[PDB]
């Protein structure tokens, strides 16, 4: 069902085709490659896939669901940002579009660089601040795919983890520069778990 790169390099990364191989892995891989080819030039070779990519390949996801997922991923993030995000860690495709929308909106609320913890600068320069907030959240997602797993802790504990990082030295603007340069949120999320 996949005359292409051999299964030997792919059986060591994906243990999903042991059970639901026939229509499942081949059609989902073909539809995902076509769904990213119809996007802005994404190849999606299967070698980069990690064993945590049981999602988007498990028996029960339709190819139409993958088509909606990639369309929602290039709708929630800009396709230049979505292409930069998908260059590293394709595990973002595992999330459902509604849950990914919820996590991105919660990240935009807590990490709002425009104003307060509330979504500052509601939509001339308010739209400019809102676009900067979308850029900041997509840059954090490019830097770390694990920030999309915030609702495992809570939608309201993103601020709690951010202050657990915040209490050491100074205020928010220094920390938006600091957290974008180093992954300080991973220890805070592990401390919350």
**Which residues form the interface with RNA (CB under 7 A)?**
115-118, 156, 159-160, 163, 166-167, 169, 171-172
What backbone phi and psi angles, to 5 degrees, belong to 122? Answer: -65, 140
- In the bound complex, what is the minimum distance in angstroms from residue 108's beta carbon to RNA? 14
- In the bound complex, what is the minimum distance in angstroms from residue 182's beta carbon to RNA? 19
Contact between residue 159 and residue 108 where contact means Cβ atoms under 8 Å apart? no
Query: Which CB sits closer to RNA, 93 or 140?
Result: 140
- In the bound complex, what is the minimum distance in angstroms from residue 116's beta carbon to RNA? 3
- In the bound complex, what is the minimum distance in angstroms from residue 119's beta carbon to RNA? 9
Distance between CA 104 and CA 39 in Å, rounded? 21
DSSP string, 37-83: HTTTS----GGG--TTTTTTTSTT--HHHHHHHHHHHHHHS-HHHHH
Query: Which CB sits closer to RNA, 61 or 178?
Result: 178
Query: Which CB sits closer to RNA, 82 or 114?
Result: 114
DSSP string, 155-172: SSHHHHHHHHHHTTS--H
- In the bound complex, what is the minimum distance in angstroms from residue 186's beta carbon to RNA? 20
Helix (H, G, I), strand (E, B) or coil at 95: coil
Contact between residue 169 and residue 134 where contact means Cβ atoms under 8 Å apart? no
Query: Which CB sits closer to RNA, 26 or 172?
Result: 172
Query: Which CB sits closer to RNA, 156 or 177?
Result: 156
């Amino acid at each position: 069902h996949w005359p292409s790169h051999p299964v030997g390099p792919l059986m060591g990364r994906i243990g999903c085709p042991v059970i639901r191989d026939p229509a499942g892995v081949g059609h989902r891989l073909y539809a995902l490659t076509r769904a990213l080819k119809t996007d802005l030039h994404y190849e999606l070779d299967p070698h980069r896939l990690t064993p945590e990519s049981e999602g988007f390949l498990a028996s029960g996801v339709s190819p139409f669901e993958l088509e909606a997922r990639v369309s929602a991923l290039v709708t929630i993030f800009g396709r230049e940002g979505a292409g930069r995000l998908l260059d590293v860690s394709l595990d973002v495709l595992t999330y459902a579009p509604r849950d990914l929308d919820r996590a991105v909106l919660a990240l935009r609320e807590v990490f709002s660089a425009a104003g307060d913890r509330g979504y500052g600068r509601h939509s001339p320069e308010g739209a400019a601040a809102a676009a900067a907030d979308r850029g900041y959240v997509t840059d954090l997602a490019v830097a770390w795919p694990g920030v999309l797993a915030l609702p495992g802790r809570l939608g309201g504990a993103d601020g709690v983890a951010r202050l657990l990082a915040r209490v050491r030295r100074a205020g928010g603007a220094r920390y938006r520069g600091a957290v974008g340069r180093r992954a300080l949120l991973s220890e805070v999320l592990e401390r919350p778990e």
